[PDB]
Amino acid sequence: SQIRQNYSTEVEAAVNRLVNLYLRASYTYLSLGFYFDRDDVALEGVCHFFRELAEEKREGAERLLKMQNQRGGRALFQDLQKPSQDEWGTTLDAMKAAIVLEKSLNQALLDLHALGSAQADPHLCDFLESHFLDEEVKLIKKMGDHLTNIQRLVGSQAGLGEYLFECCTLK
Amino acid sequence: SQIRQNYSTEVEAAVNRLVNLYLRASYTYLSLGFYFDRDDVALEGVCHFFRELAEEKREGAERLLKMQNQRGGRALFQDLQKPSQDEWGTTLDAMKAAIVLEKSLNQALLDLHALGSAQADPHLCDFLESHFLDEEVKLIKKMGDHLTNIQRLVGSQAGLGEYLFECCTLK
Amino acid sequence: SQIRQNYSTEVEAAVNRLVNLYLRASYTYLSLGFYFDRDDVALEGVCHFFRELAEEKREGAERLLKMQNQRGGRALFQDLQKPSQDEWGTTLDAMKAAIVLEKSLNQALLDLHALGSAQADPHLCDFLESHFLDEEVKLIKKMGDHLTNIQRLVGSQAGLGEYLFECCTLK
Amino acid sequence: SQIRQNYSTEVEAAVNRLVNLYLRASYTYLSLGFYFDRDDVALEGVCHFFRELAEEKREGAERLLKMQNQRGGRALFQDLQKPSQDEWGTTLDAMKAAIVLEKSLNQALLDLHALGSAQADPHLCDFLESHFLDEEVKLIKKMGDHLTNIQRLVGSQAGLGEYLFECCTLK
Amino acid sequence: SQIRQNYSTEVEAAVNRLVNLYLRASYTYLSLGFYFDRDDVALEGVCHFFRELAEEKREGAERLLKMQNQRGGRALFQDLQKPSQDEWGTTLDAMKAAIVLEKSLNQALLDLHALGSAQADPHLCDFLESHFLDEEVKLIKKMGDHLTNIQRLVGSQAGLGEYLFECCTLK
Ligand SMILES: [Cl-]
Ligand SMILES: [Cl-]
Ligand SMILES: [Cl-]
Ligand SMILES: [Cl-]
Ligand SMILES: [Cl-]
C-alpha cells in the first residue's frame, strides 16, 4: 500500500461495484445457458452462446480485480444477486434480455470512464478503452444482428427464405 | 463352476432376463432402422440413428453375457419376440417409441440394481453403474432433446425459424 | 506522348467515361454492402457479396486506366455521383438493382466495342473481349440465378422445399 | 419433461442447494486468490493455488447443473452470499479457512449421497462417487499436507531445515 | 518543419524534460546494477534486475525522442545529473529507492498527459497511454511485490517460512 498513485477512493469503490455487475452478468448467462440445455427447450447452440458469454463476463471481472490490485486499491466483494428470471422463454426473449444486460454493463463502463476522466485518471480511462468499451460495442452489434435474424426467421416465409439464401447460397 | 462367489440365483436369472430385454430392444431398433430406409419413407439419417442403437443394445447384451460368465452364472437364452410394430409412422412417432423402449430398459436396470443391493452384491451394482446407468441417462436425454426439436420443427414457422437460427447462425 | 498509335480521341474520351461508370458502380456496391451490415438488416453474406463486387468494379476501372496509359491517352477524372438509393430494401430489391447496374455497364462496354470496331482499333476490341465482356456475361448469369432463387425462397413452401432439396440432398 | 425417471423432488432440490454451495466456494476462492495478489501480501503462488480452486469449484457446479438437466430436473439459482472474510491473514490462516470450506462441501456431498441411497437413486450415488467424493478426499489430503508444511516452516529452525532437506536434497 | 500540426511548444519542451528524466533514471539504474556486482555486495540477480531497468529507461527516452521527431518538434538535450547515491545499501534500501524513482517518472508522465489534454493533443495523450502509463503501473506493482517479499524475508522466521512454502511447494 506503497504503490497507490493517482487512484481515487471514488474510482476504487466504482471498480468494486463494476466487478459485482460483471459477476452478476456472468451468473445471468450461466442461468440462460442451462435453460437452453433443458430437454424441453433443447437448443444446444443457444446454450453454448450463453455459456461462452458467462466465461467472458467472469474474465472481465477478473481483469478488473487484477487492475484494482495493480493500482493499490482493495477488492471488496458483495453478495451476488440471482438472475432476474428462472425461465428465459424463446431464443428471441433471451436475446432481448441479453442486449438489455449488455447495455447496462456498457452504461456502467461509460459512467466509470466519465468518473476517471473527471478524476484525471488516464490509466483507468485507457484500461477501459483498451479492454472493455470496444468488446461491448462489438458484442452489442452481434446481439443486434442476432435479434434481427431471429425476428426475420420467426416472422414470415419471406424472412425465412431470405435468411436461407444468405446461409445456403452466399456463405 | 469353481469360481462362483456371492452371486445369487435371483441375480443370475434376472441377468438372463435383462439379456432378453436388450436383444429384444436391438431387434426393435433393426426394424426401426430398415423402416426409415424404405423408398417411401427415405430418411437415411433416421435409419442410421436407429441402426447405431441396434448395435449399442446388442453390445449391452454381450457385456451382460460376459459378466454372467465372469461371475460363474449360466447364460440361458429365450425366444426373442418380434418388435411391437411393423411400420413406425413419422420420425416423431418413432422417437416417442424409442424413449418408451429406453425407459423400460432403464427401469429393468434400476430393478436389477435394487436386487443386487438387497443381495449385498456390490460387483453387480458397480457393473451396472459403470456400464449401463449413465449410458441410459445420456441416451434418454438425447432422445428427449430430439423429441423437442422434432415437435418444434413440425409444429410452426416460429419453431422452424428458431431451429434454423441455432443450426445456421450459432453452430 | 511518343507512343500513341491508332488510338482515336473518340475512344480516349469514351474510356475516361467508362472509368467514371465503373467507379460509380464500385461506389453503389460499397453502399449496398454496408446497408446489409446494418444491425437492423444483418445479412452478412449479402454484405460480403456486394463488397466483393465493389472491389471487382474498382479493379475494372484500374485496368481501363492502365490501358489508357498503355495506349498514350490521358486519364481524366470527373465527379463521382452518389448511388441512386440510401436504403436498398430486401435482398430481392438489391439483386434487381445490381442486375440493372450490370446491364448498364455491359451496354457501355458493347457501345465502346462498337466504337473501337468503327475506328478499326483491334487492340481496344480485344482488350474488352479478353477482360470485360465475358466477366459481365458470367456475373449477369450468376445474378439472374440468384434472383430466381430469392424469388423461389420468398414466394412459397413448394419453392423453399425445392431450394432445400438442392442444398441439403444434392450438394 | 418427458425424460425424468427415478429422480425425486428431494434430490432435485438438494442438487440446486449443492450448486449454490459450490458457487459460494468458487466465490470464496476468488477472494482468497486476489487477496494474495495484493502488493502488501504478494504471494503469487498462493494466489494461483486459490484461483485454480475457484475454477475447480465452478466446474463442479457446472457438472451438477449438467446432471440436473440430464435427469430432467430444473436448475434454480439463488443469491450467492459474499465470502466470510474480506482479508484472509497469513498463508496458514488461509489454508485453515480452505480446509474448513472443503470439509463443508464434503459433508454436503455425503449428505446428498445418503439422500440418494435412501431414495434408491443409484445414478445420483454413482455420479457423486465418480466425479466428487474422491476429488474432495484428494484435495483435503493435499490441504492437510500443506497445513503441516506451513506449520513446520513458520514454527522453528528444526522445521525449516527438515523442509529444506526434502526440497533441495531429496527432490 | 513542414510536418508540425497541433503540437504545442509547451508539450515540445515538456517532452525534452521527460527525456532528461528517463535518461537520469537509466543512469541511476546503471549505478544500482554495478553496486550489486561489487565483490563485497555480490547479488548478481539484483545487479541483473537493475541493469535491465537501465535498458528499459533508455528505450523509453528513445521512444520519446522518436515521437518528438514524428511530431516535428526538436530534441534538445541537457546535462544528465549523476545519481543521488554512490552506494545503495541493502536490497531493501535499493528497492525503496527504485519505487521512489518510478513514482517520480509516473508523476511526470501524468503531468505531461494533463498538459496534452489541456492542449487538446490526443496523439500525445494516446502515445503516453499506449507505451508508458501501463508499463509504469505494472513495474510499480512488481516493485511493491518485491518490497513486501524482501521485508518478509529479512524480518522473521515466520516470514521466511511463508516465502519458502510459496517458492518450494506451490511453484
Ligand atoms: Cl452481507
Ligand atoms: Cl421355447
Ligand atoms: Cl468539377
Ligand atoms: Cl431473491
Ligand atoms: Cl550546459
Side-chain angles (χ1 to χ4, degrees), chain A residues 37 39-46 49 90-91 146 149-150 153-154 156-157 160 163-164, chain B residues 141 144-146 148-149 152 157-166 169-170:
Chain A
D37 179 59
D39 72 273
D40 62 354
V41 178
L43 293 168
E44 289 296 339
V46 183
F49 175 79
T90 61
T91 304
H146 288 168
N149 280 99
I150 294 162
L153 276 162
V154 304
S156 73
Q157 240 234 27
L160 189 139
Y163 177 90
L164 281 177
Chain B
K141 174 57 162 66
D145 296 350
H146 288 168
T148 292
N149 280 99
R152 156 181 300 128
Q157 240 234 27
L160 189 139
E162 186 154 2
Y163 177 90
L164 281 177
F165 182 70
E166 191 260 324
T169 295
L170 294 182

mmCIF file of all heavy atoms in Angstrom, chain A residues 37 39-46 49 90-91 146 149-150 153-154 156-157 160 163-164, chain B residues 141 144-146 148-149 152 157-171, unseen atoms left out:
data_model
loop_
_atom_site.group_PDB
_atom_site.id
_atom_site.type_symbol
_atom_site.label_atom_id
_atom_site.label_comp_id
_atom_site.label_asym_id
_atom_site.label_seq_id
_atom_site.Cartn_x
_atom_site.Cartn_y
_atom_site.Cartn_z
ATOM 1 N N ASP A 37 -30.302 -25.799 -22.281
ATOM 2 C CA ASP A 37 -29.905 -27.229 -22.211
ATOM 3 C C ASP A 37 -31.023 -28.129 -21.633
ATOM 4 O O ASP A 37 -30.840 -29.370 -21.581
ATOM 5 C CB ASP A 37 -28.639 -27.326 -21.376
ATOM 6 C CG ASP A 37 -28.101 -28.742 -21.175
ATOM 7 O OD1 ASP A 37 -27.793 -29.407 -22.206
ATOM 8 O OD2 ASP A 37 -28.002 -29.152 -20.011
ATOM 9 N N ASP A 39 -34.194 -30.498 -21.508
ATOM 10 C CA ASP A 39 -34.654 -31.429 -22.569
ATOM 11 C C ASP A 39 -35.915 -30.856 -23.235
ATOM 12 O O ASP A 39 -36.180 -31.250 -24.394
ATOM 13 C CB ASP A 39 -34.908 -32.825 -22.021
ATOM 14 C CG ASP A 39 -36.129 -32.938 -21.151
ATOM 15 O OD1 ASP A 39 -36.071 -32.695 -19.919
ATOM 16 O OD2 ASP A 39 -37.249 -33.209 -21.670
ATOM 17 N N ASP A 40 -36.662 -29.981 -22.603
ATOM 18 C CA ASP A 40 -37.928 -29.405 -23.145
ATOM 19 C C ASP A 40 -37.653 -28.060 -23.841
ATOM 20 O O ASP A 40 -38.651 -27.373 -24.236
ATOM 21 C CB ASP A 40 -39.033 -29.313 -22.108
ATOM 22 C CG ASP A 40 -38.742 -28.407 -20.912
ATOM 23 O OD1 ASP A 40 -37.626 -27.927 -20.820
ATOM 24 O OD2 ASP A 40 -39.632 -28.182 -20.118
ATOM 25 N N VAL A 41 -36.417 -27.646 -23.950
ATOM 26 C CA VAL A 41 -36.005 -26.417 -24.699
ATOM 27 C C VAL A 41 -35.040 -26.863 -25.799
ATOM 28 O O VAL A 41 -35.356 -26.693 -27.002
ATOM 29 C CB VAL A 41 -35.412 -25.337 -23.762
ATOM 30 C CG1 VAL A 41 -34.952 -24.103 -24.558
ATOM 31 C CG2 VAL A 41 -36.333 -24.987 -22.637
ATOM 32 N N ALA A 42 -33.889 -27.438 -25.435
ATOM 33 C CA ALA A 42 -33.013 -28.251 -26.289
ATOM 34 C C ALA A 42 -32.556 -27.417 -27.495
ATOM 35 O O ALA A 42 -32.715 -27.826 -28.693
ATOM 36 C CB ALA A 42 -33.787 -29.525 -26.668
ATOM 37 N N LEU A 43 -31.919 -26.275 -27.273
ATOM 38 C CA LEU A 43 -31.224 -25.516 -28.323
ATOM 39 C C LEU A 43 -29.754 -25.437 -27.915
ATOM 40 O O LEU A 43 -29.369 -24.468 -27.228
ATOM 41 C CB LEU A 43 -31.937 -24.174 -28.493
ATOM 42 C CG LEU A 43 -33.353 -24.271 -29.055
ATOM 43 C CD1 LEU A 43 -34.065 -22.935 -28.898
ATOM 44 C CD2 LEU A 43 -33.291 -24.706 -30.507
ATOM 45 N N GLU A 44 -28.986 -26.443 -28.231
ATOM 46 C CA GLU A 44 -27.637 -26.574 -27.624
ATOM 47 C C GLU A 44 -26.702 -25.489 -28.170
ATOM 48 O O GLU A 44 -25.843 -25.024 -27.366
ATOM 49 C CB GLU A 44 -27.141 -28.014 -27.772
ATOM 50 C CG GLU A 44 -27.912 -28.977 -26.856
ATOM 51 C CD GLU A 44 -27.815 -28.839 -25.327
ATOM 52 O OE1 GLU A 44 -26.847 -28.233 -24.816
ATOM 53 O OE2 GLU A 44 -28.693 -29.376 -24.646
ATOM 54 N N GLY A 45 -26.904 -24.950 -29.357
ATOM 55 C CA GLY A 45 -26.108 -23.802 -29.843
ATOM 56 C C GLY A 45 -26.398 -22.544 -29.020
ATOM 57 O O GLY A 45 -25.501 -21.692 -28.853
ATOM 58 N N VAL A 46 -27.634 -22.356 -28.615
ATOM 59 C CA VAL A 46 -28.015 -21.189 -27.782
ATOM 60 C C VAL A 46 -27.394 -21.376 -26.403
ATOM 61 O O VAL A 46 -26.835 -20.364 -25.829
ATOM 62 C CB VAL A 46 -29.539 -20.978 -27.708
ATOM 63 C CG1 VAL A 46 -29.873 -19.737 -26.907
ATOM 64 C CG2 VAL A 46 -30.167 -20.895 -29.092
ATOM 65 N N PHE A 49 -23.728 -20.431 -26.725
ATOM 66 C CA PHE A 49 -23.575 -18.963 -26.893
ATOM 67 C C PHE A 49 -23.577 -18.316 -25.511
ATOM 68 O O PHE A 49 -22.678 -17.509 -25.176
ATOM 69 C CB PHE A 49 -24.715 -18.448 -27.775
ATOM 70 C CG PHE A 49 -24.758 -16.946 -27.941
ATOM 71 C CD1 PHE A 49 -23.917 -16.300 -28.826
ATOM 72 C CD2 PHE A 49 -25.685 -16.183 -27.272
ATOM 73 C CE1 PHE A 49 -23.968 -14.922 -29.008
ATOM 74 C CE2 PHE A 49 -25.724 -14.811 -27.449
ATOM 75 C CZ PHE A 49 -24.866 -14.186 -28.294
ATOM 76 N N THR A 90 -38.346 -17.835 -25.209
ATOM 77 C CA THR A 90 -37.794 -18.216 -26.502
ATOM 78 C C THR A 90 -36.380 -17.669 -26.714
ATOM 79 O O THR A 90 -35.903 -16.794 -25.922
ATOM 80 C CB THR A 90 -38.704 -17.656 -27.604
ATOM 81 O OG1 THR A 90 -38.724 -16.229 -27.485
ATOM 82 C CG2 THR A 90 -40.132 -18.149 -27.417
ATOM 83 N N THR A 91 -35.734 -18.117 -27.763
ATOM 84 C CA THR A 91 -34.435 -17.550 -28.194
ATOM 85 C C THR A 91 -34.592 -16.037 -28.344
ATOM 86 O O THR A 91 -33.690 -15.297 -27.924
ATOM 87 C CB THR A 91 -33.929 -18.185 -29.490
ATOM 88 O OG1 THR A 91 -33.847 -19.609 -29.314
ATOM 89 C CG2 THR A 91 -32.576 -17.620 -29.823
ATOM 90 N N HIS A 146 -28.187 -10.712 -34.335
ATOM 91 C CA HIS A 146 -28.922 -11.945 -33.968
ATOM 92 C C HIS A 146 -30.395 -11.654 -33.777
ATOM 93 O O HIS A 146 -31.208 -12.425 -34.330
ATOM 94 C CB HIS A 146 -28.317 -12.588 -32.720
ATOM 95 C CG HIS A 146 -27.001 -13.204 -33.005
ATOM 96 N ND1 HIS A 146 -26.122 -13.641 -32.045
ATOM 97 C CD2 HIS A 146 -26.377 -13.415 -34.174
ATOM 98 C CE1 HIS A 146 -25.079 -14.191 -32.606
ATOM 99 N NE2 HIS A 146 -25.173 -13.986 -33.937
ATOM 100 N N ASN A 149 -32.106 -11.275 -37.082
ATOM 101 C CA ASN A 149 -32.231 -12.578 -37.797
ATOM 102 C C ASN A 149 -33.267 -13.476 -37.108
ATOM 103 O O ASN A 149 -34.049 -14.156 -37.799
ATOM 104 C CB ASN A 149 -30.888 -13.272 -37.923
ATOM 105 C CG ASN A 149 -30.140 -12.637 -39.075
ATOM 106 O OD1 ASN A 149 -29.264 -11.771 -38.877
ATOM 107 N ND2 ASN A 149 -30.550 -12.981 -40.271
ATOM 108 N N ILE A 150 -33.330 -13.475 -35.774
ATOM 109 C CA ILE A 150 -34.347 -14.330 -35.120
ATOM 110 C C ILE A 150 -35.722 -13.796 -35.522
ATOM 111 O O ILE A 150 -36.628 -14.609 -35.834
ATOM 112 C CB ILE A 150 -34.133 -14.327 -33.585
ATOM 113 C CG1 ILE A 150 -32.833 -14.996 -33.196
ATOM 114 C CG2 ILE A 150 -35.306 -15.037 -32.951
ATOM 115 C CD1 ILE A 150 -32.390 -14.631 -31.811
ATOM 116 N N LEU A 153 -36.653 -14.822 -39.021
ATOM 117 C CA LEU A 153 -36.882 -16.284 -39.115
ATOM 118 C C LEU A 153 -38.235 -16.648 -38.546
ATOM 119 O O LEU A 153 -38.888 -17.539 -39.152
ATOM 120 C CB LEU A 153 -35.768 -17.038 -38.381
ATOM 121 C CG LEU A 153 -34.534 -17.249 -39.215
ATOM 122 C CD1 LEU A 153 -33.381 -17.572 -38.337
ATOM 123 C CD2 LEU A 153 -34.784 -18.351 -40.245
ATOM 124 N N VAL A 154 -38.637 -16.058 -37.437
ATOM 125 C CA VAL A 154 -39.892 -16.468 -36.761
ATOM 126 C C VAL A 154 -41.076 -15.729 -37.362
ATOM 127 O O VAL A 154 -42.203 -16.204 -37.140
ATOM 128 C CB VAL A 154 -39.807 -16.338 -35.241
ATOM 129 C CG1 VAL A 154 -38.622 -17.150 -34.694
ATOM 130 C CG2 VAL A 154 -39.786 -14.884 -34.785
ATOM 131 N N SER A 156 -42.043 -14.716 -40.796
ATOM 132 C CA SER A 156 -42.698 -14.891 -42.123
ATOM 133 C C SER A 156 -41.897 -15.836 -43.010
ATOM 134 O O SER A 156 -40.715 -16.128 -42.707
ATOM 135 C CB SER A 156 -42.900 -13.595 -42.824
ATOM 136 O OG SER A 156 -41.667 -13.095 -43.298
ATOM 137 N N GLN A 157 -42.545 -16.320 -44.065
ATOM 138 C CA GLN A 157 -41.873 -17.168 -45.084
ATOM 139 C C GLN A 157 -40.947 -16.321 -45.933
ATOM 140 O O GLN A 157 -39.863 -16.849 -46.237
ATOM 141 C CB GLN A 157 -42.852 -17.924 -45.968
ATOM 142 C CG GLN A 157 -42.644 -19.425 -45.840
ATOM 143 C CD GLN A 157 -42.433 -20.057 -47.186
ATOM 144 O OE1 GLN A 157 -41.950 -19.416 -48.130
ATOM 145 N NE2 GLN A 157 -42.776 -21.333 -47.259
ATOM 146 N N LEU A 160 -37.806 -16.102 -43.595
ATOM 147 C CA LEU A 160 -37.071 -17.384 -43.557
ATOM 148 C C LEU A 160 -36.355 -17.602 -44.907
ATOM 149 O O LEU A 160 -35.167 -18.049 -44.914
ATOM 150 C CB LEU A 160 -38.042 -18.524 -43.246
ATOM 151 C CG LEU A 160 -37.287 -19.822 -42.993
ATOM 152 C CD1 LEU A 160 -37.883 -20.579 -41.838
ATOM 153 C CD2 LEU A 160 -37.265 -20.643 -44.250
ATOM 154 N N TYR A 163 -33.265 -15.454 -45.198
ATOM 155 C CA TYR A 163 -32.215 -15.996 -44.305
ATOM 156 C C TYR A 163 -31.534 -17.169 -44.985
ATOM 157 O O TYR A 163 -30.272 -17.246 -44.957
ATOM 158 C CB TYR A 163 -32.839 -16.400 -42.968
ATOM 159 C CG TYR A 163 -31.867 -17.030 -42.007
ATOM 160 C CD1 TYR A 163 -31.158 -16.248 -41.114
ATOM 161 C CD2 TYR A 163 -31.699 -18.389 -41.954
ATOM 162 C CE1 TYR A 163 -30.309 -16.819 -40.183
ATOM 163 C CE2 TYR A 163 -30.818 -18.980 -41.061
ATOM 164 C CZ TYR A 163 -30.146 -18.191 -40.142
ATOM 165 O OH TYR A 163 -29.281 -18.777 -39.252
ATOM 166 N N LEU A 164 -32.317 -18.116 -45.519
ATOM 167 C CA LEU A 164 -31.784 -19.365 -46.116
ATOM 168 C C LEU A 164 -30.914 -19.028 -47.329
ATOM 169 O O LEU A 164 -29.900 -19.725 -47.520
ATOM 170 C CB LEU A 164 -32.910 -20.331 -46.466
ATOM 171 C CG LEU A 164 -33.475 -21.129 -45.290
ATOM 172 C CD1 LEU A 164 -34.631 -21.983 -45.748
ATOM 173 C CD2 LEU A 164 -32.402 -21.995 -44.653
ATOM 174 N N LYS B 141 -31.703 -38.514 -22.398
ATOM 175 C CA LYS B 141 -31.608 -37.026 -22.501
ATOM 176 C C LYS B 141 -31.535 -36.653 -23.987
ATOM 177 O O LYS B 141 -32.229 -35.687 -24.401
ATOM 178 C CB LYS B 141 -30.398 -36.496 -21.765
ATOM 179 C CG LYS B 141 -30.125 -34.983 -21.921
ATOM 180 C CD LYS B 141 -31.235 -34.060 -21.524
ATOM 181 C CE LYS B 141 -30.819 -32.623 -21.286
ATOM 182 N NZ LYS B 141 -30.336 -31.946 -22.527
ATOM 183 N N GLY B 144 -34.902 -37.080 -25.590
ATOM 184 C CA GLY B 144 -35.813 -36.030 -25.170
ATOM 185 C C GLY B 144 -35.514 -34.731 -25.958
ATOM 186 O O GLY B 144 -36.469 -34.077 -26.398
ATOM 187 N N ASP B 145 -34.234 -34.398 -26.085
ATOM 188 C CA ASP B 145 -33.792 -33.232 -26.919
ATOM 189 C C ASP B 145 -34.307 -33.394 -28.337
ATOM 190 O O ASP B 145 -34.868 -32.448 -28.881
ATOM 191 C CB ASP B 145 -32.286 -33.039 -26.955
ATOM 192 C CG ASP B 145 -31.615 -32.683 -25.609
ATOM 193 O OD1 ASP B 145 -32.307 -32.383 -24.636
ATOM 194 O OD2 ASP B 145 -30.366 -32.798 -25.536
ATOM 195 N N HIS B 146 -34.147 -34.577 -28.928
ATOM 196 C CA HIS B 146 -34.630 -34.838 -30.305
ATOM 197 C C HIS B 146 -36.131 -34.671 -30.387
ATOM 198 O O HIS B 146 -36.582 -33.993 -31.335
ATOM 199 C CB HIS B 146 -34.199 -36.226 -30.779
ATOM 200 C CG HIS B 146 -32.744 -36.285 -31.050
ATOM 201 N ND1 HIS B 146 -32.037 -37.443 -31.257
ATOM 202 C CD2 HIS B 146 -31.831 -35.303 -31.101
ATOM 203 C CE1 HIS B 146 -30.790 -37.168 -31.533
ATOM 204 N NE2 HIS B 146 -30.615 -35.840 -31.357
ATOM 205 N N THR B 148 -38.117 -32.840 -28.595
ATOM 206 C CA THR B 148 -38.490 -31.431 -28.504
ATOM 207 C C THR B 148 -38.203 -30.770 -29.838
ATOM 208 O O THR B 148 -39.013 -29.915 -30.276
ATOM 209 C CB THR B 148 -37.712 -30.779 -27.345
ATOM 210 O OG1 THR B 148 -38.206 -31.362 -26.128
ATOM 211 C CG2 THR B 148 -37.823 -29.271 -27.325
ATOM 212 N N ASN B 149 -37.057 -31.047 -30.442
ATOM 213 C CA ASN B 149 -36.694 -30.399 -31.736
ATOM 214 C C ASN B 149 -37.617 -30.885 -32.861
ATOM 215 O O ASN B 149 -38.027 -30.075 -33.714
ATOM 216 C CB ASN B 149 -35.233 -30.623 -32.076
ATOM 217 C CG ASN B 149 -34.410 -29.637 -31.276
ATOM 218 O OD1 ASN B 149 -33.840 -29.978 -30.221
ATOM 219 N ND2 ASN B 149 -34.433 -28.400 -31.711
ATOM 220 N N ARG B 152 -40.847 -28.983 -32.393
ATOM 221 C CA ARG B 152 -40.628 -27.564 -32.767
ATOM 222 C C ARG B 152 -40.709 -27.438 -34.289
ATOM 223 O O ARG B 152 -41.412 -26.535 -34.785
ATOM 224 C CB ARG B 152 -39.276 -27.136 -32.189
ATOM 225 C CG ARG B 152 -38.564 -25.977 -32.863
ATOM 226 C CD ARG B 152 -37.236 -25.658 -32.212
ATOM 227 N NE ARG B 152 -37.445 -25.299 -30.821
ATOM 228 C CZ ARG B 152 -36.815 -25.845 -29.754
ATOM 229 N NH1 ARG B 152 -35.928 -26.811 -29.870
ATOM 230 N NH2 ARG B 152 -37.106 -25.383 -28.559
ATOM 231 N N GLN B 157 -44.037 -22.175 -37.909
ATOM 232 C CA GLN B 157 -42.962 -21.387 -38.565
ATOM 233 C C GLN B 157 -42.093 -20.723 -37.515
ATOM 234 O O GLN B 157 -40.874 -20.705 -37.759
ATOM 235 C CB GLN B 157 -43.495 -20.349 -39.539
ATOM 236 C CG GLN B 157 -42.968 -20.608 -40.942
ATOM 237 C CD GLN B 157 -42.301 -19.384 -41.502
ATOM 238 O OE1 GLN B 157 -41.779 -18.539 -40.762
ATOM 239 N NE2 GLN B 157 -42.301 -19.309 -42.823
ATOM 240 N N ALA B 158 -42.633 -20.217 -36.402
ATOM 241 C CA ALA B 158 -41.782 -19.721 -35.295
ATOM 242 C C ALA B 158 -40.806 -20.842 -34.892
ATOM 243 O O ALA B 158 -39.611 -20.572 -34.803
ATOM 244 C CB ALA B 158 -42.566 -19.227 -34.098
ATOM 245 N N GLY B 159 -41.282 -22.073 -34.702
ATOM 246 C CA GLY B 159 -40.409 -23.182 -34.251
ATOM 247 C C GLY B 159 -39.351 -23.522 -35.282
ATOM 248 O O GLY B 159 -38.142 -23.645 -34.932
ATOM 249 N N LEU B 160 -39.737 -23.698 -36.527
ATOM 250 C CA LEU B 160 -38.745 -23.978 -37.588
ATOM 251 C C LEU B 160 -37.702 -22.841 -37.622
ATOM 252 O O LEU B 160 -36.474 -23.131 -37.762
ATOM 253 C CB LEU B 160 -39.460 -24.125 -38.932
ATOM 254 C CG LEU B 160 -38.497 -24.618 -40.003
ATOM 255 C CD1 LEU B 160 -39.148 -25.649 -40.884
ATOM 256 C CD2 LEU B 160 -37.984 -23.449 -40.794
ATOM 257 N N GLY B 161 -38.145 -21.571 -37.541
ATOM 258 C CA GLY B 161 -37.170 -20.470 -37.615
ATOM 259 C C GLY B 161 -36.191 -20.508 -36.462
ATOM 260 O O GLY B 161 -35.002 -20.245 -36.673
ATOM 261 N N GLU B 162 -36.675 -20.820 -35.283
ATOM 262 C CA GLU B 162 -35.814 -20.870 -34.077
ATOM 263 C C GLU B 162 -34.797 -22.019 -34.213
ATOM 264 O O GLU B 162 -33.570 -21.858 -33.940
ATOM 265 C CB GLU B 162 -36.726 -21.021 -32.878
ATOM 266 C CG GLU B 162 -36.022 -20.949 -31.568
ATOM 267 C CD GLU B 162 -36.934 -20.467 -30.460
ATOM 268 O OE1 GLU B 162 -38.114 -20.226 -30.736
ATOM 269 O OE2 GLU B 162 -36.491 -20.342 -29.333
ATOM 270 N N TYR B 163 -35.239 -23.137 -34.778
ATOM 271 C CA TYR B 163 -34.330 -24.276 -35.044
ATOM 272 C C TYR B 163 -33.246 -23.838 -36.012
ATOM 273 O O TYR B 163 -32.046 -24.157 -35.775
ATOM 274 C CB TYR B 163 -35.135 -25.457 -35.590
ATOM 275 C CG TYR B 163 -34.294 -26.649 -35.960
ATOM 276 C CD1 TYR B 163 -34.023 -27.632 -35.027
ATOM 277 C CD2 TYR B 163 -33.822 -26.818 -37.235
ATOM 278 C CE1 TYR B 163 -33.305 -28.764 -35.370
ATOM 279 C CE2 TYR B 163 -33.060 -27.920 -37.591
ATOM 280 C CZ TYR B 163 -32.832 -28.920 -36.660
ATOM 281 O OH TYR B 163 -32.086 -30.017 -37.014
ATOM 282 N N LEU B 164 -33.631 -23.196 -37.123
ATOM 283 C CA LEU B 164 -32.690 -22.809 -38.202
ATOM 284 C C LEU B 164 -31.665 -21.809 -37.661
ATOM 285 O O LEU B 164 -30.498 -21.894 -38.086
ATOM 286 C CB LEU B 164 -33.436 -22.269 -39.416
ATOM 287 C CG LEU B 164 -34.053 -23.329 -40.330
ATOM 288 C CD1 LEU B 164 -34.828 -22.671 -41.442
ATOM 289 C CD2 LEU B 164 -32.984 -24.243 -40.903
ATOM 290 N N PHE B 165 -32.063 -20.892 -36.792
ATOM 291 C CA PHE B 165 -31.124 -19.880 -36.236
ATOM 292 C C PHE B 165 -29.984 -20.601 -35.510
ATOM 293 O O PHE B 165 -28.817 -20.252 -35.705
ATOM 294 C CB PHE B 165 -31.843 -18.967 -35.249
ATOM 295 C CG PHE B 165 -30.905 -17.918 -34.719
ATOM 296 C CD1 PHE B 165 -30.467 -16.911 -35.571
ATOM 297 C CD2 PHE B 165 -30.475 -17.975 -33.425
ATOM 298 C CE1 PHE B 165 -29.590 -15.945 -35.101
ATOM 299 C CE2 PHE B 165 -29.624 -16.988 -32.947
ATOM 300 C CZ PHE B 165 -29.200 -15.981 -33.797
ATOM 301 N N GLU B 166 -30.345 -21.559 -34.662
ATOM 302 C CA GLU B 166 -29.409 -22.393 -33.846
ATOM 303 C C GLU B 166 -28.477 -23.153 -34.807
ATOM 304 O O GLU B 166 -27.246 -23.127 -34.597
ATOM 305 C CB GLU B 166 -30.224 -23.270 -32.897
ATOM 306 C CG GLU B 166 -29.398 -23.957 -31.837
ATOM 307 C CD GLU B 166 -29.083 -25.387 -32.140
ATOM 308 O OE1 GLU B 166 -29.987 -26.033 -32.724
ATOM 309 O OE2 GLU B 166 -27.955 -25.851 -31.786
ATOM 310 N N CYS B 167 -29.026 -23.703 -35.882
ATOM 311 C CA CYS B 167 -28.318 -24.576 -36.845
ATOM 312 C C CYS B 167 -27.386 -23.720 -37.737
ATOM 313 O O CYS B 167 -26.153 -23.957 -37.727
ATOM 314 C CB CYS B 167 -29.373 -25.412 -37.576
ATOM 315 N N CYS B 168 -27.900 -22.687 -38.407
ATOM 316 C CA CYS B 168 -27.188 -21.953 -39.476
ATOM 317 C C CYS B 168 -26.389 -20.774 -38.897
ATOM 318 O O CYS B 168 -25.386 -20.424 -39.523
ATOM 319 C CB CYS B 168 -28.167 -21.505 -40.535
ATOM 320 N N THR B 169 -26.809 -20.136 -37.790
ATOM 321 C CA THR B 169 -26.067 -18.966 -37.256
ATOM 322 C C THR B 169 -25.195 -19.412 -36.089
ATOM 323 O O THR B 169 -23.996 -19.120 -36.113
ATOM 324 C CB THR B 169 -26.959 -17.809 -36.791
ATOM 325 O OG1 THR B 169 -27.639 -17.276 -37.924
ATOM 326 C CG2 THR B 169 -26.169 -16.681 -36.150
ATOM 327 N N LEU B 170 -25.734 -20.092 -35.089
ATOM 328 C CA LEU B 170 -24.934 -20.273 -33.851
ATOM 329 C C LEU B 170 -23.922 -21.417 -34.007
ATOM 330 O O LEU B 170 -22.815 -21.244 -33.482
ATOM 331 C CB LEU B 170 -25.839 -20.466 -32.640
ATOM 332 C CG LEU B 170 -26.669 -19.246 -32.276
ATOM 333 C CD1 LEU B 170 -27.483 -19.522 -31.041
ATOM 334 C CD2 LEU B 170 -25.819 -17.999 -32.083
ATOM 335 N N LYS B 171 -24.222 -22.470 -34.760
ATOM 336 C CA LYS B 171 -23.349 -23.669 -34.891
ATOM 337 C C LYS B 171 -23.062 -23.967 -36.369
ATOM 338 O O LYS B 171 -22.790 -23.048 -37.145
ATOM 339 C CB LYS B 171 -23.996 -24.850 -34.197
#
